[PDB]
Amino acid sequence: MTPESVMMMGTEAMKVALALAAPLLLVALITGLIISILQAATQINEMTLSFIPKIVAVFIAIIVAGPWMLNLLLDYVRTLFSNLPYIIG
Amino acid sequence: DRLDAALRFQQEALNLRAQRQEILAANIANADTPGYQARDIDFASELKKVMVVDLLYRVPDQPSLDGNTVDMDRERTQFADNSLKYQMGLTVLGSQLKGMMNVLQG
Amino acid sequence: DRLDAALRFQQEALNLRAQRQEILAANIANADTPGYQARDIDFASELKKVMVRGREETGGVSSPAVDLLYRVPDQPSLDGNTVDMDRERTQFADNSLKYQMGLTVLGSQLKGMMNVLQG
Amino acid sequence: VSFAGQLHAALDRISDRQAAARVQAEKFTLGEPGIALNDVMADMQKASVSMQMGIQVRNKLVAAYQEVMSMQV
Amino acid sequence: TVSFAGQLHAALDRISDRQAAARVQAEKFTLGEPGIALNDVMADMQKASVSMQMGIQVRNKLVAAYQEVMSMQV
Amino acid sequence: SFAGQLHAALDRISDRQAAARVQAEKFTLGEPGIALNDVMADMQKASVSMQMGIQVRNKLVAAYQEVMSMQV
Amino acid sequence: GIALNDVMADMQKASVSMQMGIQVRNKLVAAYQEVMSMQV
Amino acid sequence: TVSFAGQLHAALDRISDRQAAARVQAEKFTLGEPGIALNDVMADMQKASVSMQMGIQVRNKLVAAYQEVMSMQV
Amino acid sequence: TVSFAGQLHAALDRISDRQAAARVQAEKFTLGEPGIALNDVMADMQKASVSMQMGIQVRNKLVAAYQEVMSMQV
Amino acid sequence: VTSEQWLYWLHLYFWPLLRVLALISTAPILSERAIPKRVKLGLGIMITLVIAPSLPANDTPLFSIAALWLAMQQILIGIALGFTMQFAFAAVRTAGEFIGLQMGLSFATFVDPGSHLNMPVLARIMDMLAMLLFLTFNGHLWLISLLVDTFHTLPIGSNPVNSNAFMALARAGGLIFLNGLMLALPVITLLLTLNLALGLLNRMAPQLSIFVIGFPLTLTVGIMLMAALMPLIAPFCEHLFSEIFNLLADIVS
Amino acid sequence: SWSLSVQTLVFITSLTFLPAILLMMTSFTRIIIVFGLLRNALGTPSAPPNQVLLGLALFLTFFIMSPVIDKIYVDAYQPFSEQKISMQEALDKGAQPLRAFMLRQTREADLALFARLANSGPLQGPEAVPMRILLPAYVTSELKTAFQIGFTIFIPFLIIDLVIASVLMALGMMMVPPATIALPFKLMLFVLVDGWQLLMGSLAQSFYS
Amino acid sequence: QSWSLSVQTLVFITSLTFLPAILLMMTSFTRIIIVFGLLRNALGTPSAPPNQVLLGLALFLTFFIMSPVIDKIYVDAYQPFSEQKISMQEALDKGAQPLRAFMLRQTREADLALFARLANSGPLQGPEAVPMRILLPAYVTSELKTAFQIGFTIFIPFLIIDLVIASVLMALGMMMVPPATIALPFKLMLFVLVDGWQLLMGSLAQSF
Amino acid sequence: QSWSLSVQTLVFITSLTFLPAILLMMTSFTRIIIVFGLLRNALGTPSAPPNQVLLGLALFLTFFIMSPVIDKIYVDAYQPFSEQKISMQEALDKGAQPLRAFMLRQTREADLALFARLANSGPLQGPEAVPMRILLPAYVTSELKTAFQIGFTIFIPFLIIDLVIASVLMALGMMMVPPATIALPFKLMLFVLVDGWQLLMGSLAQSF
Amino acid sequence: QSWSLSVQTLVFITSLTFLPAILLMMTSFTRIIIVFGLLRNALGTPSAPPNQVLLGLALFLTFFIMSPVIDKIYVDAYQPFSEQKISMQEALDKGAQPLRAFMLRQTREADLALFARLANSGPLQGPEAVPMRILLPAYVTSELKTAFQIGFTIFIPFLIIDLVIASVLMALGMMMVPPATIALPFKLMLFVLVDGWQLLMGSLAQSFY
Amino acid sequence: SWSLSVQTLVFITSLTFLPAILLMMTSFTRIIIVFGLLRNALGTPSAPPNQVLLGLALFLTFFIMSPVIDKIYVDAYQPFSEQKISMQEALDKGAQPLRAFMLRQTREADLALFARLANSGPLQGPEAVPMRILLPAYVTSELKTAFQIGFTIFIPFLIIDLVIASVLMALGMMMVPPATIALPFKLMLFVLVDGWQLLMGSLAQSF
């Protein structure tokens, strides 16, 4: 009820969002950086060949860590809906 | 039912008026029977009793030779009065029902 | 103000009809009282008077500020009242119909207004 | 004092008038002396008129409430 | 444990038994059975009519309220 | 033009209403030469004209709202 | 006291004025919501 | 195999037969055919009117319900 | 080639013709014409009223259908 | 007897109802479409029932241009109060949308302005957070109290009015921008530095950077930055509400 | 007591205000606001059709207001039907359990504000609060509670859209709408975590707590 | 014991007011209409088939699905009531049985358990002890959940097409094109080459 | 057997109530309306022709297409009824046949089989005896499928134009130039030059 | 032969409902608003002037365009109606002819031929004998085609500006600069200096002649 | 003076056209278009909500109409009570200030075009321009004025965007999008100079 509880609500929610999005974004960033440094080493420059492995890497990311995200988000939503009638004002 | 309690008094008065009307007409019809006693009911007491019949003999006025105590004038006046009061009771009961109706109509 | 002014003539005429019928009923009630002059009012003059200056009362026992005029008797009577029953019942019926006419006109105007407002 | 108070007062007045007329009618039907049929019938007439007035006031009041609740905010 | 459906059933029963009682009284009075009075027959019929008008008005109010509630948008 | 025709129609309807009201007012005072049936017929004609005006206004307002709600 | 003639007439006048107020406010509110439902 | 259109057709036809029977009975009574009583004629006419009013009310309720069902935003 | 405008014009003409015939008969009866009876005048007026009411209801249904069809989002 | 003067009650209960309902239809949270219309109308009716008997009743007829002027006055007061309150949520929405646009969340607006493709999801997040905070600080009760209080300052009866006062509300349009800049500032600046850092990477071997490495890094950095910045809005939320409230108090009079 | 005609008139008139009682004195407002907000959240403004949600809200309100209705029936309707309590006293007796139910769920701040706006004297205990103060205080408290519940409801459905947009933006697909992708995932979430049982139980507890 | 004919007429004509409510809450109309709306959202165009066509088609589908239940009601309740062999109340009680079975067969256990918890129900026992006022909201909740389960998996192929087209377009280089604009004709192609409408009706019918 | 006059007018008004449903689900209005909406979406102009204009065009096209069916109904069914030659029941039965034939001409056998198998209908010999309750949903489904086919096919030339302009812009290095702004005027030019409106209406009419 | 007053009132009020349909399918309005719907797209601001401003401007322009037709209808048909020298049927027959001529002069022959063939009409001797059922949809089709022609032609100078600005931006190596935002103010410049609105309305009015 | 019921009908009917009066007769279109163009300038098409922009334009319109409202009050509101002039002579008298304002804000070319569109040859004087010719001409003039003000607003933001892109290109960056960098600088320039208050002051001065 108190504004401290509200702002905590937003923080924990958006940290959950950060945890959900961090693996995919970080995998894409690492793949892009690796392809870019390889291009710099080989002196190859086409703006389209960096887009190819990124999709494959990010799609594999759901294969490997997808169940973890799905279990984390469901637990968050379940706990939020269960604690809903105790943060009422 | 509450509807009965509102209309109980007028219904009982109307029924008692009809019964006393029948008794008075029986007195008129049996005017010529020798040895017939003129019977009547006390309207107020019986109305109390029903709201909360017994027949009372009429006090004779003139002594006849055949034992008939029915007097024409007295019972004719009572008959006319009972008819008037029956009409009044019908009017009052109809007014109460019509009021209960116009309360509902809409 | 505008709506009050538009509906004021018929409303005042209907009130004056009511008061005139009260007077006529008083005349009918006193029809057998010895020594009672029948009373009546001039509807048009009193209506214009109430129109220009608002309604007023003698007290408020209360009564209107209307002028109770005497009716001219038709034929003499020993008891000394001038309530002629034919005149009383003709004025009663005429006032009845005119009051119903006022009710009809006022109700028509008020519907004629709800028709506009309703939507 | 208030509008609800005024409506309650009007309802109480109308009911009291109706009950008085009914009680006088029952007293006349009872046979008790002094009660005239003229007064009974006139009081029943007045009670009926008062009931009809109350019914009309209720009808309008309900119509006005329905009109107000129909307003779009 | 109150029941609105049970209360409606009880009210409908009250109306229906009142109507049936008046009808049976008229039945016996037409058949000529002694003990039945015409004024009682008429009074019971009018009471049944008043009860049915009660029921009709309550039905109208309930249906109007339900329709106005269900015509609302969330 | 169109506003002029609307103004003329409104003026005719109001003249109807005023004539009916004046005739009824004169008849209320007891003035001779005015009959009850004529008063009632004029009142009903004025009511009919006013209802026609109301209906025309409703149709025109609905048409304007429907036109102005289009997605360009 | 006040008679049915006056009671009914003022009762009707009040009903008419209340209906007029309701309709005028509804027109004003509809115009305001049409203005605010704009797209700039 | 229950078709609602079939039941509506059956009810409509039954109303029609009641109306036609009442009309023919009144027709025959007017032509002075012995064996027809006025009270039965009026009673059957009133029954036909009751049946037609019941059909009207059922149609009104069905049409209203169809319009409320058919106007929802999908 | 059947056209709906032609059918609507024909129906309107039929309604107008019935109304005009009833009005003419009533006017002639008021003027003291011998070969016209009051019952026929009233029955013809009632039939014209019924026909015009049917026309009004058909117009209302047609307008409702048109306003429903033209309110689509295509 | 049996008077029940209807015009007096109508004139006593009408104009306060007009002002209360005008505030209701525009005041934040009380004007959200999720509330059924009848609930709003009943709340206005009950508030007027509580308030009106204490006020002096007006006698101007409903069938006069004075009634129209009164109705216009009540509508103006109500909408002014509600809108001045709404300005704070407008500012919060602006700050959130700008943080989100510097996230690169909706890049299609820079190439197709207003092309039916925009999702200010951060703006919505902080808008609903601001609504929750406003509910917590009981701002709506205050709004209702001030709606009542503006009578003593400005009675129902037609009163003369001023000018630059309207400008003030219009000039409040600056606050939406001015306060929005500060909220962002605590994050956009660092994001700016991040973009500057990306520029340093592009000053190396040409191409092979930006649109491939910049977007995910800046998205994650914006996310965690403003996730850490979330505790900061609440003091700024109270600051915004206080600014709107005392501006309203000063200018309405 | 009143005449039977007056009692029938009052009963028929009072039957009119049933929607007002349902909306302003009952648990209906919070549930309907929460349902509308949730429907706004999932991105399907016409999904459970208004009638379905209205029926569910009516059944929920009937299940929630059961003890209050039972207390009213046992204390007011039963004595009134048995001709033990007059018609003008059954209303007063039955208005007390509803008043208590409205009080418990209301809030001090609203009560203080509406006690100040009426210029009423000090209210040392809750037993001195009239209905003219409790009604709008209860209404405002219910509105605020419903909006709080809905606004904490809204957060996950916006979180999903945020992460969807960020993931789409990582790969450079800047012209893909995020709402169209997020809607199936929001539906999947609301299916998985017992979308309705948890919400139903949370609302019911929110009343009984 | 039987109700009077006036009471029967009053109840019968009053019950017709709940016909839309019965059709929506108690029958299969809700699930079909929700699935159709979700499919319209999934097609890429929000209002391609007018709401009227979808509503009529959903009504026909609901009638065809519920025809066995309607036949059972007619055999059990309507026919013996119309022949004046059973009373109105007993006819309603008998006719509530097949509809209760239909509602139970598609009811989630958790929904029924929760709504029995909220209604203070204690020793329930046989599946034939659940009252109508408890069974109905549980059925509605289960129908909403099932409709959402169907919709979110109806969404899948169109998301696949959208993602494939966007990925191909951006990887090829044309990153300034709107992928949805090019994708919509392909969504229509997929829907018409699979016979999406016929298969969707088959799946919706076989869901019961 | 002939319905009394009051029953006849009750039936007539109740049937007039169902007019939009008949127009949408029995005539060619739905397919034309769907194709028009898809075409409007295809030009990149979501609100250029107002909905009322397209609705009126679809209504007129439907009237022209259904003129032979209406003529058959008039000649075979309505005309004898208006001359009191036949009753209303047999007139309606005779008028059903031409409309039924028209709807059967434009339905797909697979959808008819689906709805027959779903409704548990017994084997039906030939097209002569197929209930309207079976034919109507099948015809609606077939119309939906055909409309989607036509719209998807129509979507092709604008896709060609968009792709060619996007490629021309991209091969010039113009990386941040959106192709919609350049494509919309050329889409309008393409639709104007081929006499698009009359050609598309003629194609829709010819397909019926 | 004249219709009764009740039938005349019924027909008049019924025909009052077709006012938007008549305006769209029979007057100039369809060509105007559609062009506006495209012009706001050419300027790069879909918001543009608000929708209601454009609609009302189109309405005023339509009234000015149809002033001669309205005057001819008022003179030939409605004036005898008001002065009682004509019936409602004859007035409806006579007043449509100038509007039919106005519709025919802007109707392409190909569309008219298409709708004839589609109605299986017999040999029409001359323009004067063309049925309204054939003239209305053909006029709407030709109207749409003409509006699209005008809109595409309007789309030209803004395309010129966009191409020039994009070429200038790319020739300087400023490849990462979106040219839409830069070229929008120059489109506004072009519309201001040349007096785009007045020129466009004059061109539309002259086009209808 | 005609009937009261007809007066009520006309008043409620004229109440419907209130958005038309606000848009076509007052200046509301100018401020709303200026706000839309300014929002398009900063690069954020949803930063202030459309509701807030509409309300700000409404308040600005109310102030800038306050002199005309005062003239209406003097010429129409007051004498309608003293009944020196009423009904016809006054509604037109009260509308006269609107005519003066719209003549002031209307260009001559639009009026000339709309006159030759109505074949009104003998329109010689400039205070007897009919409403049919005055209204659309005034709307077109308002559109032109709003577009000019929008371009003037556009100039500094376009300059800032160009400068940011030029410095990015000169510094060696060829891939960094200049919009992301230039957006916060656009905002800090807009706030620091206090763009909003000067913009409203100029709009009020713009009449």
Numbering used by the authors:
A (entry chain D): 1 to 89
B (entry chain U): 3 to 54, 83 to 136
C (entry chain Q): 3 to 62, 78 to 136
D (entry chain P): 32 to 104
E (entry chain O), H (entry chain N), I (entry chain M): 31 to 104
F (entry chain L): 33 to 104
G (entry chain K): 65 to 104
J (entry chain E): 4 to 256
What does the literature reporting this entry say, word for word?
To obtain the C ring-containing basal body–hook complex in the CW state, we constructed the constitutively active double mutant D13K/Y106W of CheY (hereafter referred to as CheY**), which can mimic CheY-P to tightly bind to the C ring and lock the rotational direction of the motor in the CW state. The density maps of the LP ring, MS ring, rod, hook, and export apparatus in the CW state were locally reconstructed to the higher resolutions ranging from 2.8 Å to 3.8 Å. Although the structures of the LP ring, MS ring, rod, hook, and export apparatus in the CW state are highly similar to those of these components in the CCW state, the protomers of the C ring in the CW state notably undergo inclination and compaction, suggesting that the binding of CheY** induces significant conformational changes of the C ring for rotational switching.
The bacterial flagellar motor is a huge bidirectional rotary nanomachine that drives rotation of the flagellum for bacterial motility. The basal body is made up of the LP ring, MS ring, C ring, rod and export apparatus. Here, we present two high-resolution cryo-electron microscopy structures of the C ring-containing flagellar basal body–hook complex from Salmonella Typhimurium, which are in the default counterclockwise state and in a constitutively active CheY mutant-induced clockwise state, respectively.
